[PDB]
Amino acid sequence: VHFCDKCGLPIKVYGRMIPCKHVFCYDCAILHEKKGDKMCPGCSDPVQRIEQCTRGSLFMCSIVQGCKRTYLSQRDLQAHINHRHMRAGKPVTRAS
Amino acid sequence: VHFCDKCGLPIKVYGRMIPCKHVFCYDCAILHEKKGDKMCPGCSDPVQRIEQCTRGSLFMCSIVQGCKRTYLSQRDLQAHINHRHMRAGKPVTRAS
Ligand SMILES: [Zn+2]
Ligand SMILES: [Zn+2]
Ligand SMILES: [Zn+2]
Ligand SMILES: [Zn+2]
Ligand SMILES: [Zn+2]
Ligand SMILES: [Zn+2]
């Protein structure tokens, strides 16, 4: 039982983004696509196409590591964070 | 003071991979490049070129999040882990 944080309903069919391979509620993925959005809602990579996938057909990587990408200005680092990390889950910190 | 885990010496000049933006000991990055390696040693993305960067000129993203990429077989997930995660730092786990 996984609830979609966009529509609020339990997900039974997923949309798998190609080629970044992130998954989301299928109906919301399509809706998003219909609207002209061509970026992955979670990582912002370009999306070539969306695959339909039933709940039990997927093997998800759950490895948690630091990003470690580097930027030449604090401004560019902030833009990277806004672009890449804001919908990619709660950041893990000692403050927990 | 950051020691290189390849050569073992303290790093004063970094090589910044373009476009994945990971950084490594400059001398080892070049050496690796001289050998014909065109993949980032940390994330395995293709590397277009290597930028030379002094220690204090970089702003690193330290956000720690889960990967969450999905695969259609356990075998493909394992290949992804071997390809993407083995030199990307200690995975964060409760087992700590
Ligand atoms: Zn939804
Ligand atoms: Zn993505
Ligand atoms: Zn992964
Ligand atoms: Zn080195
Ligand atoms: Zn890299
Ligand atoms: Zn980052």
Short mmCIF file of C-alpha atoms and ligand atoms in Angstrom, two decimals:
data_model
loop_
_atom_site.label_atom_id
_atom_site.label_comp_id
_atom_site.label_asym_id
_atom_site.label_seq_id
_atom_site.Cartn_x
_atom_site.Cartn_y
_atom_site.Cartn_z
CA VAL A 1 0.00 0.00 0.00
CA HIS A 2 1.68 3.16 -1.30
CA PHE A 3 -0.30 6.41 -1.37
CA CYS A 4 0.32 9.00 -4.07
CA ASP A 5 1.41 12.35 -2.60
CA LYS A 6 -0.06 14.19 -5.57
CA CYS A 7 -3.55 12.75 -5.92
CA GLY A 8 -3.76 11.12 -2.48
CA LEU A 9 -4.96 7.71 -3.67
CA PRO A 10 -3.32 4.29 -3.16
CA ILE A 11 -1.18 3.36 -6.15
CA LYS A 12 -1.88 0.12 -7.99
CA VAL A 13 -0.19 0.98 -11.28
CA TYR A 14 3.11 2.89 -11.57
CA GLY A 15 4.64 5.00 -14.28
CA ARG A 16 8.36 4.29 -14.65
CA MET A 17 10.32 7.16 -16.14
CA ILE A 18 12.76 6.29 -18.90
CA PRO A 19 15.71 6.59 -18.67
CA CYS A 20 16.11 7.82 -15.07
CA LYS A 21 14.01 4.85 -13.82
CA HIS A 22 12.18 6.64 -10.99
CA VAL A 23 8.55 5.61 -10.41
CA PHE A 24 5.39 7.51 -9.58
CA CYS A 25 1.62 7.09 -9.48
CA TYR A 26 0.78 6.14 -13.08
CA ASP A 27 -2.29 8.37 -13.43
CA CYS A 28 -0.44 11.43 -12.18
CA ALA A 29 2.58 10.68 -14.37
CA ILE A 30 0.31 10.56 -17.45
CA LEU A 31 -1.62 13.66 -16.37
CA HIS A 32 1.71 15.46 -15.97
CA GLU A 33 2.75 14.23 -19.44
CA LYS A 34 -0.54 15.40 -20.97
CA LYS A 35 0.23 18.87 -19.60
CA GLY A 36 3.50 19.02 -21.53
CA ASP A 37 5.90 18.21 -18.72
CA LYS A 38 8.94 16.30 -19.93
CA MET A 39 10.95 16.27 -16.72
CA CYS A 40 10.91 13.60 -14.01
CA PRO A 41 8.94 14.95 -11.05
CA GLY A 42 11.51 13.54 -8.62
CA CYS A 43 14.96 14.15 -10.13
CA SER A 44 14.14 16.53 -13.03
CA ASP A 45 16.02 14.49 -15.67
CA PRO A 46 14.49 14.58 -19.17
CA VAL A 47 11.95 11.81 -19.71
CA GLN A 48 11.92 9.99 -23.06
CA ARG A 49 8.84 7.90 -22.25
CA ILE A 50 6.74 6.50 -19.41
CA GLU A 51 6.37 2.73 -18.87
CA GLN A 52 3.33 1.21 -17.20
CA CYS A 53 4.25 -1.15 -14.38
CA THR A 54 2.23 -3.13 -11.85
CA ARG A 55 3.18 -2.85 -8.20
CA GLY A 56 4.90 -6.21 -7.85
CA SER A 57 7.02 -6.13 -10.99
CA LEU A 58 9.70 -3.70 -9.77
CA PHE A 59 12.98 -3.97 -7.88
CA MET A 60 13.86 -0.61 -6.27
CA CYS A 61 17.34 0.49 -5.22
CA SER A 62 17.18 1.82 -1.65
CA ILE A 63 20.83 2.74 -1.18
CA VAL A 64 21.21 6.07 0.68
CA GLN A 65 24.40 8.02 -0.12
CA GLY A 66 25.53 11.63 -0.29
CA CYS A 67 25.20 13.61 -3.53
CA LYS A 68 28.73 15.11 -3.61
CA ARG A 69 28.27 17.03 -6.89
CA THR A 70 30.24 20.30 -6.89
CA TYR A 71 29.41 23.82 -8.00
CA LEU A 72 31.51 26.93 -8.69
CA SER A 73 29.22 29.26 -6.77
CA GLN A 74 26.90 29.02 -3.81
CA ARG A 75 24.18 30.32 -6.11
CA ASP A 76 24.72 27.40 -8.51
CA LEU A 77 24.67 24.93 -5.62
CA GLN A 78 21.37 26.38 -4.44
CA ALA A 79 19.93 26.15 -7.96
CA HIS A 80 21.06 22.49 -8.07
CA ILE A 81 19.33 21.78 -4.74
CA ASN A 82 16.10 23.43 -5.97
CA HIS A 83 16.30 21.47 -9.23
CA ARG A 84 17.32 18.05 -7.96
CA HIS A 85 16.42 17.56 -4.31
CA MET A 86 13.16 19.21 -3.37
CA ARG A 87 10.93 16.31 -4.31
CA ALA A 88 13.42 13.51 -3.81
CA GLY A 89 12.50 12.64 -0.23
CA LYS A 90 13.43 13.75 3.28
CA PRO A 91 17.17 14.44 3.47
CA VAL A 92 18.87 12.21 6.06
CA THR A 93 20.56 14.27 8.80
CA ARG A 94 21.94 13.73 12.28
CA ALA A 95 19.15 16.09 13.32
CA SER A 96 16.97 13.00 13.63
CA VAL B 1 43.03 18.22 4.46
CA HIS B 2 41.51 15.53 2.23
CA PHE B 3 43.54 12.39 1.47
CA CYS B 4 43.19 10.62 -1.86
CA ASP B 5 42.02 7.02 -1.44
CA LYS B 6 43.78 6.02 -4.65
CA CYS B 7 47.26 7.45 -4.28
CA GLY B 8 47.14 8.11 -0.53
CA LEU B 9 48.40 11.69 -0.66
CA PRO B 10 46.67 14.88 0.59
CA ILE B 11 44.81 16.59 -2.23
CA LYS B 12 45.63 20.20 -3.07
CA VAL B 13 44.26 20.26 -6.61
CA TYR B 14 41.02 18.54 -7.69
CA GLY B 15 39.77 17.24 -10.99
CA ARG B 16 36.10 18.07 -11.50
CA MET B 17 34.30 15.72 -13.86
CA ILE B 18 32.12 17.33 -16.51
CA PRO B 19 29.17 17.01 -16.64
CA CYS B 20 28.46 14.87 -13.55
CA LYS B 21 30.40 17.38 -11.36
CA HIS B 22 31.98 14.88 -8.96
CA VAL B 23 35.53 15.67 -7.80
CA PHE B 24 38.62 13.58 -7.21
CA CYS B 25 42.37 13.92 -6.67
CA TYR B 26 43.52 15.78 -9.80
CA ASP B 27 46.64 13.69 -10.44
CA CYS B 28 44.72 10.42 -10.22
CA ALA B 29 41.90 11.77 -12.40
CA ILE B 30 44.44 12.67 -15.12
CA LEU B 31 46.30 9.37 -14.73
CA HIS B 32 42.97 7.57 -15.12
CA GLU B 33 42.24 9.69 -18.22
CA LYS B 34 45.67 8.93 -19.70
CA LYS B 35 44.82 5.23 -19.38
CA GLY B 36 41.74 5.64 -21.57
CA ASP B 37 39.08 5.70 -18.87
CA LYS B 38 36.14 7.91 -19.81
CA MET B 39 33.85 7.10 -16.90
CA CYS B 40 33.61 8.96 -13.59
CA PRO B 41 35.31 6.84 -10.93
CA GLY B 42 32.52 7.59 -8.45
CA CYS B 43 29.23 7.45 -10.38
CA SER B 44 30.34 5.92 -13.72
CA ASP B 45 28.68 8.60 -15.88
CA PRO B 46 30.52 9.42 -19.13
CA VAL B 47 33.07 12.21 -18.67
CA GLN B 48 33.38 14.85 -21.41
CA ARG B 49 36.35 16.62 -19.80
CA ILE B 50 38.16 17.19 -16.51
CA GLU B 51 38.43 20.67 -14.95
CA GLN B 52 41.29 21.65 -12.68
CA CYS B 53 40.09 23.20 -9.42
CA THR B 54 41.85 24.40 -6.29
CA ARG B 55 40.57 23.18 -2.94
CA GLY B 56 38.79 26.35 -1.87
CA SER B 57 36.96 27.13 -5.10
CA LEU B 58 34.22 24.49 -4.81
CA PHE B 59 30.77 24.30 -3.22
CA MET B 60 29.79 20.63 -2.65
CA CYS B 61 26.24 19.34 -2.26
CA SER B 62 26.10 17.11 0.83
CA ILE B 63 22.43 16.14 0.70
CA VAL B 64 21.92 12.45 1.58
CA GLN B 65 18.84 10.81 0.00
CA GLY B 66 17.78 7.39 -1.23
CA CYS B 67 18.43 6.34 -4.83
CA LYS B 68 14.93 4.96 -5.62
CA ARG B 69 15.72 3.97 -9.24
CA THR B 70 13.79 0.84 -10.28
CA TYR B 71 14.77 -2.26 -12.21
CA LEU B 72 12.77 -5.05 -13.89
CA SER B 73 14.91 -7.84 -12.46
CA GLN B 74 16.95 -8.42 -9.34
CA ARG B 75 19.89 -9.10 -11.65
CA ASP B 76 19.53 -5.64 -13.23
CA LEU B 77 19.28 -4.02 -9.79
CA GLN B 78 22.48 -5.78 -8.74
CA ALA B 79 24.23 -4.63 -11.93
CA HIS B 80 23.07 -1.07 -11.17
CA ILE B 81 24.48 -1.28 -7.62
CA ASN B 82 27.83 -2.59 -8.95
CA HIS B 83 27.91 0.17 -11.57
CA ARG B 84 26.73 3.14 -9.55
CA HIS B 85 27.28 2.64 -5.83
CA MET B 86 30.47 0.75 -5.07
CA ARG B 87 32.74 3.77 -5.00
CA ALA B 88 30.18 6.37 -4.00
CA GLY B 89 30.76 6.25 -0.25
CA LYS B 90 29.53 4.25 2.74
CA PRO B 91 25.80 3.59 2.40
CA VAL B 92 23.84 5.07 5.32
CA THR B 93 21.94 2.38 7.25
CA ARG B 94 20.24 1.99 10.61
CA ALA B 95 22.96 -0.60 11.24
CA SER B 96 25.06 2.27 12.55
ZN ZN C 1 -1.45 10.14 -8.11
ZN ZN C 2 13.99 10.72 -12.20
ZN ZN C 3 20.78 2.97 -6.80
ZN ZN C 4 45.34 10.58 -5.88
ZN ZN C 5 30.34 11.29 -11.36
ZN ZN C 6 22.99 17.42 -4.74
#
